[PDB]
Nucleic acid binder design. Structure first.
Ligand SMILES: Cc1cn([C@H]2C[C@H](O)[C@@H](COP(=O)(O)OP(=O)(O)NP(=O)(O)O)O2)c(=O)[nH]c1=O
Ligand code: NA
Length: 342
DNA sequence: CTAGGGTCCTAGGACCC
DNA sequence: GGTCCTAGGACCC
């Protein structure tokens, strides 16, 4: 009853694409991210930049202090999506059991594969080698009996490498595995787990499920399961997008409704264009807006609405502006749509 | 000195029986 | 007791 799961994961995806398409960027620190004047953050960075401490989600101002010579690139999302479509077509050569998680990564369920003598290790190697050919980007991979171990595994031999976890190896791997390494355990959850003396899966194994359920809800059942290598989530190839959003951080805050309305006027065609690619008649389940204020508090307001409509987004943003603002400056404006259920 | 694309979970009151 | 509506938050890429 044991499954073979591969998690395939592109190395420094956006940056690797920019380096292939401009070899001059190979050995200098580079990053995709908005400028400091735009109040941007790092999307990702190459290994020369990471050597200085540059990380995804880091404010560009902090990145540049760590790495004064950092080259900042705007990002070319159609180039990234083209690489994505190609690696996914490569995955299909081995199995239809493909669950994309993002542009640059996917789960593959190769249990019923008879490629490469049924070896998931060699299938993962072949996909990585085929990706390096054909695209001149490198990938890493993880091979495990369940999703989350495969995903942790793909990080352990990166870049351009892989790691395999057999069922016989699962207990020793789990024993000292930090909880923070479990997908879905973030900074807040790890800090809370740490505050009750839980750091590793070995720690959680010695815990009562009932306590975890009280203390954490359904997440605590996930914690109890993962700490034991239990992860029955199937590789699902039939997931569909449920929302589409378009939002903008300004280079400095706005304090007048006229400015907000102007922002909306430029955002709305972008929202309409992306919605129409997937829903030509613009028919939707809800639409709404987002403001992010001075104190970084965020409010959304969204309602049932049959079809993308600019004026109603303006009107509801005006309400949000007047009501839930309380005189602060505004750093971000966003528009949002919730897609119909089929 | 804090993006923009998203997913999933929670929870109170409305609404229904 | 269910289920829908809405707002917010943690989290991932
Ligand atoms: C974590 C992260 C990623 N991205 C974009 C840019 C990344 O290149 C792309 C894939 O995300 P990964 O977490 O896999 O990071 P990576 O750049 O590919 N480096 P890796 O080699 O460690 O996987 O997704 C962002 O825009 N913001 C992010 O916070
Ligand atoms: Na990656």
């Amino acid at each position: 009853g044991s499954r073979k799961i591969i998690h395939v994961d592109m190395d420094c995806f956006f940056a690797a694409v920019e380096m292939r398409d401009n070899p001059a960027l190979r050995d200098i620190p580079i990053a995709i991210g908005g400028s400091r004047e735009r109040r941007g953050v790092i999307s990702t960075a190459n290994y020369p930049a990471r050597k200085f401490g540059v990380r995804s989600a880091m404010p560009t101002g902090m990145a540049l202090k760590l790495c004064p010579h950092l080259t900042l690139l705007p990002g070319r999302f159609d180039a990234y999506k083209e690489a994505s479509n190609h690696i996914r077509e490569i995955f299909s050569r081995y199995t239809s059991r493909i669950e994309p998680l993002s542009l640059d990564e996917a789960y593959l369920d190769v249990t019923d594969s008879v490629h490469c003598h049924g070896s998931a290790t060699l299938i993962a190697q072949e996909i990585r080698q085929t990706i390096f050919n054909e695209l001149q980007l490198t990938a890493s991979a993880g091979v495990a009996p369940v999703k989350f171990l495969a995903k942790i595994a793909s990080d352990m031999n990166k870049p351009n490498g892989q790691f395999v976890i057999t069922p016989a190896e699962v207990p020793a791997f789990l024993q000292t595995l930090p909880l923070a390494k479990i997908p879905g355990v973030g900074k807040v959850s790890a800090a809370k787990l740490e505050a009750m003396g839980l750091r590793t899966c070995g720690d959680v194994q010695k815990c009562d499920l009932v306590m975890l359920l009280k203390r954490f809800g359904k997440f605590g059942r996930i914690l109890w399961e993962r700490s034991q290598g239990i992860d029955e989530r199937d590789v699902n190839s039939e997931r569909l997008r449920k929302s589409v959003g378009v939002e903008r951080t300004m280079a400095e805050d706005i304090h007048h409704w006229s400015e907000c309305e102007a922002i909306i006027e430029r955002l709305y065609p972008e929202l309409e264009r992306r919605l129409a690619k997937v829903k030509p008649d613009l028919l939707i389940a809800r639409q709404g807006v987002k403001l992010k204020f001075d104190d970084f508090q965020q409010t959304t307001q969204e309602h049932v609405w049959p079809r993308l409509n600019k004026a109603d987004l303006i009107a509801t943003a005006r309400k949000t502006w007047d009501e839930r603002r309380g005189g602060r400056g505004v750093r971000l404006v966003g528009l949002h749509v919730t897609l119909l259920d089929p």
